[PDB]
From a paper:
N4-like phages have a genome size of about 75 kb, nearly twice that of T7, and encode around 70–90 ORFs, including a characteristic large virion-associated RNA polymerase ([name]) unique to this family of bacterial viruses. The massive 3,500-residue [name] 18,19, present in 4 ± 1 copies inside the mature virion 20, is ejected into the host upon infection. In stark contrast to the N4 transcriptional program, which has been studied extensively 17, many key questions about the role of phage N4 [name] as an ejection protein and its part in the DNA ejectosome remain unanswered. [name] ([name]) consists of three predicted domains: a likely membrane-spanning N-terminal domain (NTD), a single-subunit RNA polymerase ([name]) domain, and a large C-terminal domain of unknown function (CTD). In this study, we use a complementary top-down and bottom-up approach by determining the cryo-EM structures of both the full-length recombinantly expressed [name] and the fully asymmetric N4 virion tail.
Single particle analysis (SPA) of cryomicrographs revealed a heterogeneous mix of particles with two predominant and two minor populations. N4 isolated [name] and ΔN-[name] tight complex were real-space refined to a model to map correlation coefficients of CC = 0.90 and 0.84, respectively. Without the CTD, the B-motif loop is folded into a beta hairpin that sits outside the active site. Thus, [name] can be rationalized as three globular, folded units flexibly connected by at least two extended linkers. These linkers may explain why SPA of vitrified [name] also captured individual [name] and CTD domains if the two domains are separate in a “split complex”. However, the FL enzyme synthesized less RNA product as a function of time, consistent with the proposed autoinhibitory effect of the CTD.
Numbering used by the authors: 1007 to 2101
Write the structure that this text describes.
Amino acid sequence: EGIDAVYPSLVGTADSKAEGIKNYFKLSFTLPEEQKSRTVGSEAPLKDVAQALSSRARYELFTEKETANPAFNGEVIKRYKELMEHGEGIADILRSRLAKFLNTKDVGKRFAQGTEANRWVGGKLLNIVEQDGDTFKYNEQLLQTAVLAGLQWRLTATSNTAIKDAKDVAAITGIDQALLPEGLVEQFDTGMTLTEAVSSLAQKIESYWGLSRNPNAPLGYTKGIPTAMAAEILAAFVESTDVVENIVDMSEIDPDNKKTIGLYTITELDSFDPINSFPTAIEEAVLVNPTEKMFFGDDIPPVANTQLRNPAVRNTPEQKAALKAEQATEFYVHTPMVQFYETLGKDRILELMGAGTLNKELLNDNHAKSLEGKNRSVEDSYNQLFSVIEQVRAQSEDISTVPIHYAYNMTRVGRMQMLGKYNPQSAKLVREAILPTKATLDLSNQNNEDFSAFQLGLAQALDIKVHTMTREVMSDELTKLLEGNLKPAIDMMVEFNTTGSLPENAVDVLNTALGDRKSFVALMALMEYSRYLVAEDKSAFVTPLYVEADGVTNGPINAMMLMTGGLFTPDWIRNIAKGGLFIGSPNKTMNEHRSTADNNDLYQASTNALMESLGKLRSNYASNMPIQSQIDSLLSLMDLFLPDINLGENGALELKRGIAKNPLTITIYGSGARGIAGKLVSSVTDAIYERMSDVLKARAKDPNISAAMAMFGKQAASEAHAEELLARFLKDMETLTSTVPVKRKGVLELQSTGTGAKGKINPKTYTIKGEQLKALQENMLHFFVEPLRNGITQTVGESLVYSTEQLQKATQIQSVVLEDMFKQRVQEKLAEKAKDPTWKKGDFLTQKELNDIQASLNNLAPMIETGSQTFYIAGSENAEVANQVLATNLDDRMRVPMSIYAPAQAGVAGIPFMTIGTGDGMMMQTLSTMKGAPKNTLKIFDGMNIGLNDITDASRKANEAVYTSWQGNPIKNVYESYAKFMKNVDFSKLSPEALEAIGKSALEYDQRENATVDDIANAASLIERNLRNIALGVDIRHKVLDKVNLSIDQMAAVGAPYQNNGKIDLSNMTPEQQADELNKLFREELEARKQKVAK
């Protein structure tokens, strides 16, 4: 009688075992104990809410608050009057589409005779209708409340959707990640798919309805009825031209693919629309506890209870404390930076920091696609920032004294991420306008310690390697720039502060002065320095300039410290010193190491090893003439378009440290050899497309120019030199696309493909794809990637790559078993429902039944616990388990598949989870909750912005947090979960498909052709004892390193190292001598543990 008294006019009885028509709306939802929405019980929600928005006094009375938001002024009130009238016309469209549905094929006539038309996949909206004469009609309270949710969704959906990477697009389309076309990713994130639009809209509808789900009701109605309403509202928005629908066909690019995907984009409002200063008036008027809002002053966001998009995992108490500290920081608006942005204008901002205007008649088709994506990011960030400024400006007359708070949540890899799309932590344009840092300095004397901090901040913003030089040397470098190239730019900024105007050629002045140092952070350095020059009182200068403590190769260094076992080697000691770990050198900073000891970082070290491997490969095939020519063509092509590859006049090959940046970072991230090859080739094709645009530009200026000079005009001193380069380009492309190398029996053989490149090119629409693209990747994989991966292994160590292999095998095997049991357990439950008369196919399972299936998997240890963090590698949301349609609209379109939260195969995702989660993720968690933690800082991943008044103390604390995170044992945590899984697993109950996947990870190629169940089980237990041996070695190494004196300078910006107060002196020793001393303590620790066990 609870919900049966609020909606007594609904069609059908509320009994699950009735005879006629049953109402599944009242059987699936229940009234809450305390109210959550103010529209429950009303008769005209679209009229009561519109009345409350007509005045400030009425808004306060309806909301029951002392005062309303100051931004809710008269201009905003007028704009909401038109929006409410627009929402009344949306309801008229919905009411007219229902009458057509009941008229075609006599649906209404049959439904009134007893036919269960409300249980259809498209008739699920018949559970919220009422009888009216001989026909049916909507329920006014339920219909008008859903319209209000659509209006709020239309205003803020874009600024809340997630960002799709290349991996996500590949899964949706089905095309291989390494063969994704040009601009496909940039097209996908512009709009949203059907599933994303409907699911997000349906979430708001349920919230506004203010009801609670029934745990014993089928998932086909608790999730289908809200979804069926969302699809109808989205269809109405398309008819009203509020949402534009675009259809992309995969058969155009891949004829073998028959998938069709629709994309929906919301039409955006004007940048001067007064509604942009307060777009959450409807949300705060309906919900008792609004979710979308901006926090001012003492308004502190609440702490989330579960991980991001991982509802099965809850934040640990240690993780919740870190979130609370990060949400207490106050942000402030820098007025001089804001006025500079609006004076320059959006057009000049795009011209300076973007691609500017585009003339598509002189651009390549593929080149123009990338330029538009660059412009979109800058333009969207500019619009988002100035909408916030409008809201802040209404709170007080002084915009610089309004504190701002931001919400945080935990990423599945243990990373604190700001909520929203464009915020200081994500957008660089917004980062320079809203700052949490402040300082007061005495700059009346140039020899003060305060002036040295001021110079350090300016130098780092102007692209100067401050962590590789001493303070005195850095000061000399900055002085030359200030009085040299940057002088014209400073003069313009000085006039701007006093007057407030800019010249018509301001873009050209900044472009010439900055050059290769152009960035958003470099603009603030010019303004801050110019403001200091005109300050009347330099002894109390207040500035928001900061210094960023950036880690030196944070990724690779963490891996070699956390997942390395065995005895110490001199090579490890030398290579780990480049990361900031010094043994036997008290109070040694990174600036001293680079200046005197070693000036090569990890990126340069791997480049040198790559040259060594490349020379050995050529010498192996010295007698093979066809193989030698193929290697020459690959290097020749990369020399023409990549600045990191250079060939001398004598044929000597020279490489730069910039060729191993990306490969080294993604190698630690578990990416395979094919992934590196695909990215390397993509860099070459981008340069080729850009060179085609120069051909079109040169032809327009001079139609009589030659083809060679139109291409390599600026890369050749004479015309004859230009003709030489053109011949090289044509020959290399034909050679690299005609034959490919095939690795058989351990040797490489050239095999023809028959799909070589022929004909005359067209600069406007030149494209490389199909079999031509695959031929290029085959040559790159076997001739350049293989030598590259050998050099990387030599630097990081052979033991580190051994730990990654066992970790990948252990996680993949566990995920395969979990996925098979989940699918095998929901099919047995469905077979039981077939004997239930009150059950129909399409209702799926129940939330109570789904929770029992997941609880039965607890004896296999699906989650990894480290004591302060939790990880769930196999968790995902997929529609494979349900394999059925959830709901459609009244036109039998917009079919939405049903997706549930079920485990899935891991693959190579195990390595990134533990390298990042226990690496920089744990370091930043400690830094926010440690004793005497730094205050007023912005914590970007592997970085931290610090004010000029606390650079020394905060840098020392950052190095202390790094040392704490190096005492962990990620392998031991994985071993403990894997040992429990092996105790309870039963391989004899696995499907034949599952047994084939496990054999691909535990056995060799020859051993898995006819392997039995016993062979697979025996091979899986071997991995268990491999993890135990690795984990024991890591534990001993950390114990030994804690007994000696160490200096930690991983955050090398300032030069404030941290000492571990060890009591063993290893100074005045070579790395060869230190390894022997460390190995002596390693053998003593092993003996004690074995002796203790014996006792």
